[PDB]
Structure formats: structure tokens, C-alpha cells
């Protein structure tokens, strides 16, 4: 991404190196780690960190083609009011063994929506959780077991739906959850 490539370009100036991103991983709400390598030797990776600008969260991407043509995890930055995310840390919300994101409401009318979320490993790839789902109005209303992702639909109604949040069950293959609300049909 523009952001992860910039991390590599800035990392290479001190040695005149022509570095490009190999892959990149979200490590928190706004932080990410990039692995960089010289254009002439994809094998010579080095690790470097970045942080998304104010008002933006890290957004994990998958199967993004890098400079050498390999499809890899990548990271970009997205407005913090368009993405849900959480890792297992102290000021993550914990409920009944689950890590829960912030809760919020879209500003649309009565519409069918999709609640899309995935869990990710520490290496930035899709992972696996024993249980993941979403809360509505502060209560667990949907869950799905032993998966990397969820995408239930829902007839959103602003009069009855005050908030949604996503949750996952942390484990060796579930470090971060990332979710969005989207129009569906």
C-alpha cells in the first residue's frame, strides 16, 4: 500500500537502498509491521514498524501483489469510523471469554446490511477462532464456530438497532478481529 511502501522507502534512505514491501501486518488499532526487501533481492527481508495517521485504523489486506509479483498480506489505513477491530489486550473489551470491538450504528435508514468480519493470525493471514459473531444492543445475537470469517445479513432498523459490535474467541490462530458493516441485497 502507499503506507507500507512509504515505510520501506524511508527505511532504505540511510543506505541508499531501493526497498519495497514484501508483506505487512496490522498489530493493533493503528499500528502495523512491514517486512521490506531490496528490489534486487527479495530474500533479504528486514522488519520495520509504522502507525496509521490520526483518525485512522490499520486495515489488514490479503493476497495483494507486491513488487516481485507475490500475493501477500498488506496493510493500509482506513477511517476509524468505518472499521471495527480489536486484539486481545487489557483495554480490549472482554465478555464471557470473548474479545469484543467498539459498538456503533450506521447512519442509514431501514436497509439490509451485511456484518463482515474475519480473524487474523499474528502473521497477518486469515486465522481460525473457536467462536466469532456479533452483539446487537449489547447482547450476543449471532455466533459461528470454528471459522476464519463471518458474513451474516441483517435487516437494519434504526428504531430497534442501537448498536452492533463484533467478537471473537482468542487463540493461537486468532490475534485480531476486523469487521465492517456493508449494504447487502
Amino acid at each position: 500500500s502507499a503506507h507500507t511502501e512509504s515505510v520501506c522507502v524511508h527505511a532504505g534512505t540511510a543506505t541508499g537502498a531501493d526497498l519495497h514491501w514484501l508483506n505487512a501486518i496490522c498489530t493493533g488499532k493503528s499500528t502495523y509491521t512491514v517486512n521490506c526487501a531490496p528490489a534486487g533481492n527479495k530474500n533479504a527481508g528486514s522488519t520495520h514498524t509504522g502507525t496509521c495517521p490520526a483518525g485512522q485504523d490499520c486495515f489488514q489486506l490479503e493476497q495483494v501483489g507486491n513488487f516481485w509479483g507475490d500475493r501477500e498480506p498488506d496493510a493500509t489505513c482506513s477511517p476509524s469510523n468505518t472499521v471495527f477491530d480489536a486484539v486481545d489486550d487489557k483495554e480490549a473489551t472482554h465478555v464471557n471469554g470473548k474479545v469484543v470491538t467498539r459498538a456503533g450504528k450506521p447512519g442509514i435508514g431501514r436497509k439490509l446490511i451485511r456484518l463482515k468480519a474475519q480473524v487474523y493470525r499474528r502473521d497477518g493471514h486469515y486465522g481460525q477462532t473457536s467462536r466469532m459473531g456479533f452483539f446487537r444492543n449489547g447482547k450476543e445475537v449471532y455466533h459461528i464456530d470454528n471459522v476464519a470469517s463471518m458474513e451474516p445479513t441483517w435487516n437494519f432498523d434504526p428504531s430497534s438497532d442501537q448498536s452492533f459490535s463484533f467478537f471473537f474467541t482468542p487463540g493461537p490462530n486468532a490475534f485480531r478481529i476486523q469487521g465492517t458493516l456493508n449494504l447487502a441485497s
Binding site: 482506513s78 477511517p79 469510523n81 468505518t82 472499521v83 471495527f84 467498539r102 459498538a103 456503533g104 450504528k105 450506521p106 447512519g107 442509514i108 446490511i113 442501537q162 448498536s163 465492517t180 458493516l181 456493508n182 449494504l183
Partner: peptide, 23 residues
């Protein structure tokens, strides 16, 4: 004759994430 070689894609942005108002 006049057939265009290649691929067109007219996709919209309606699938974009919705803006969220947090509680």
C-alpha cells in the same frame, strides 16, 4: 470489426463500508 480486445469493468462503490456512529 471494431471488436475491442481486453476486459471492461464498470463496478460501483456501493459495497463500501458504512460510516459508524459509536456509542
Amino acid at each position: 470489426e471494431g471488436d475491442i480486445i481486453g476486459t471492461f469493468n464498470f463496478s460501483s462503490s456501493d459495497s463500501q463500508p458504512l460510516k459508524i456512529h459509536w456509542v
